[PDB]
Amino acid sequence: NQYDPSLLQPVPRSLNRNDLHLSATLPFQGCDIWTLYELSWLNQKGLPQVAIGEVSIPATSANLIESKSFKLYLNSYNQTRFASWDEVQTRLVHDLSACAGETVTVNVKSLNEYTAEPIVTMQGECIDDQDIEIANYEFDDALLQGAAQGEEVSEVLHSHLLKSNCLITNQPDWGSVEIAYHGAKMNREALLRYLVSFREHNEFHEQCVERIFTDIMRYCQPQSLTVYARYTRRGGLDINPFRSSHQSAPNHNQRMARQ
Amino acid sequence: NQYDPSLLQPVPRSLNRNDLHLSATLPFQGCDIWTLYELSWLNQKGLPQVAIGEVSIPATSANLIESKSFKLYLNSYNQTRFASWDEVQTRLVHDLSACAGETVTVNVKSLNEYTAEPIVTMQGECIDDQDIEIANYEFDDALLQGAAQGEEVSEVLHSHLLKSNCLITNQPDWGSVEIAYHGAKMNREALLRYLVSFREHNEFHEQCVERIFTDIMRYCQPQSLTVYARYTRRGGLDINPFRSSHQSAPNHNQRMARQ
Numbered sequence: 001n002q003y004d005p006s007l008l009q010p011v012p013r014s015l016n017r018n019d020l021h022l023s024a025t026l027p028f029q030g031c032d033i034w035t036l037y038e039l040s041w042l043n044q045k046g047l048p049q050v051a052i053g054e055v056s057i058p059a060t061s062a063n064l065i066e067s068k069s070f071k072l073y074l075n076s077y078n079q080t081r082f083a084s085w086d087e088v089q090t091r092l093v094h095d096l097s098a099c100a101g102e103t104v105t106v107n108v109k110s111l112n113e114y115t116a117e118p119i120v121t122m123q124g125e126c127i128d129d130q131d132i133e134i135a136n137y138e139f140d141d142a143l144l145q146g147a148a149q150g151e152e153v154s155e156v157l158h159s160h161l162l163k164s165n166c167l168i169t170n171q172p173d174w175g176s177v178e179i180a181y182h183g184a185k186m187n188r189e190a191l192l193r194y195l196v197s198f199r200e201h202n203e204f205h206e207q208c209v210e211r212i213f214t215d216i217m218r219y220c221q222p223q224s225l226t227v228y229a230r231y232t233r234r235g236g237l238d239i240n241p242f243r244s245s246h247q248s249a250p251n252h253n254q255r256m257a258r259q
Numbered sequence: 260n261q262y263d264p265s266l267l268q269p270v271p272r273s274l275n276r277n278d279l280h281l282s283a284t285l286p287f288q289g290c291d292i293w294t295l296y297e298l299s300w301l302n303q304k305g306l307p308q309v310a311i312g313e314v315s316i317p318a319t320s321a322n323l324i325e326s327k328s329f330k331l332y333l334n335s336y337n338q339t340r341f342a343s344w345d346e347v348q349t350r351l352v353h354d355l356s357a358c359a360g361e362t363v364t365v366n367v368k369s370l371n372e373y374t375a376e377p378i379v380t381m382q383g384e385c386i387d388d389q390d391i392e393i394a395n396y397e398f399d400d401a402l403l404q405g406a407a408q409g410e411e412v413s414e415v416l417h418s419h420l421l422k423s424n425c426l427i428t429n430q431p432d433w434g435s436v437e438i439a440y441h442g443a444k445m446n447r448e449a450l451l452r453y454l455v456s457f458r459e460h461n462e463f464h465e466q467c468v469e470r471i472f473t474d475i476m477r478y479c480q481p482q483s484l485t486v487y488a489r490y491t492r493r494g495g496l497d498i499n500p501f502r503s504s505h506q507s508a509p510n511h512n513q514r515m516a517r518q
């Protein structure tokens with residue numbers, strides 16, 4: 001029940017990226033943004049404190065943090081006294097930075113800081129309003145083959161239809177994904193079908209955004225590209241991987257409808 | 260994977276209420292409001308659809324619905340084709356009504372209906388900003404003994420500090436609770452301590468709001484009382500039990516910061 005930094009568990013980013021056939025020199029930059037909805041500890045008099053945490057881990061870090069460990073580690077704060085909120089933020093910064101292996105930023109925000117904050121949508125045009133018949137729910141990266149055959153355009157497209165099963169639990173993981181690019185026009189039927197083909201496939205969040213990035217770069221060869229997914233929480237935590245050929249982070253961490 | 264109304268599981272409301280020593284004639288009215296964050300099915304062409312559901316179950320119903328069943332039942336929609344959104348809403352209304360045993364209302368809302376909706380706080384004065392030393396985290400209803408000893412007032416008090424372990428999983432369940440009353444002034448230290456004493460205790464949401472109601476009525480004897488808790492989601496679903504001596508439902512189902 002007492003605070004225990006030894007609970008966290010790293011996962012090497014290299015494993016997954018060795019699978020996308022990715023080098024020691026990265027095609028993307030960016031970050032993994034996490035929202036910690038159920039962050040709670042005790043003050044020095046034993047009264048519970050509650051807050052929301054917002055964390056950003058560099059995509060260049062050696063490790064990401066094993067989700068179930070991130071969760072037990074947050075749990076250990078629940079019955080531990082800390083004298084001030086800054087103490088808590090200091091601990092979160094240190095431990096998450098040490099686990100991931102690169103400085104991680106952490107904001108600890110009190111709940112009143114969320115009063116009147118609006119729900120946001122994604123940028124760009126939603127592509128989910130298509131009258132197409134759906135074939136696959138098994139994955140197929142070659143769904144993007146031939147998808148970019150137009151005039152060179154600057155677009156942002158998004159879909160709320162991304163879903164995949166957790167490698168571990170096999171329950172669905174739900175998300176919206178935003179794809180900004182400059183290059184030959186992407187066919188929206190192909191792209192939507194590509195996204196939908198994740199449905200019954202087993203995938204991990206960070207792994208997912210990186211695969212979408214590398215498949216689009218491969219198949220559609222834009223000049224520039226950004227892929228950003230925003231997933232709904234599991235066990236009090238949500239993950240929002242951002243990967244770009246030029247931008248290092250999104251402008252804010254505002255929540256979407258399902259999050 | 261296909262839609263299966265047989266998945267739902269009722270739990271008699273009478274079991275819990277036989278434990279609060281409550282009669283066949285109810286001291287409260289109200290409802291259980293649920294938000295279904297991850298509601299998804301296929302259209303008649305096999306393309307996924309996503310929505311948020313908002314459900315209200317009468318507190319007078321014979322049963323509530325076993326949470327893990329509610330969850331598997333929603334899952335069964337995920338790979339099932341339905342020709343229209345209204346078909347889906349019709350099915351949800353029927354099945355949840357049949358399970359609970361009284362008409363349940365259901366709204367199925369598209370995600371764009373949430374664009375720009377604000378995060379709300381609770382009504383009344385927060386009582387969590389107290390410089391008191393905390394003793395218990397084991398439950399004690401008699402924490403309210405002697406708590407109401409003032410002038411007769413009309414107040415609304417709320418706390419974001421409600422937490423208890425799930426009877427099943429023993430992980431914490433997190434919530435904010437809003438207490439509106441007219442009657443002798445409640446001591447805020449007592450009330451806060453009473454609420455905090457749920458922390459390490461094992462409780463069920465609906466059971467929890469009903470116990471807070473009956474303990475306050477017992478110990479503090481207000482003329483009128485409303486207890487409303489809003490919990491954070493588990494497995495895509497949140498529960499918001501509302502119990503009142505005069506009001507049958509809250510004015511809206513707007514989400515709070517942690518939800």
Ligand SMILES: Nc1ccnc(=O)[nH]1
Pocket residue numbers: 064065066067068204205206239
């Ligand atoms: N288990 C995990 C799932 C998703 N992201 C992680 O970092 N870890």
Ligand SMILES: Nc1ccnc(=O)[nH]1
Pocket residue numbers: 323324325326327463464465498
């Ligand atoms: N298992 C459950 C937990 C909370 N509420 C329910 O209705 N069921």
Ligand SMILES: [Cl-]
Pocket residue numbers: 233234235236492493494495
């Ligand atoms: Cl969850």
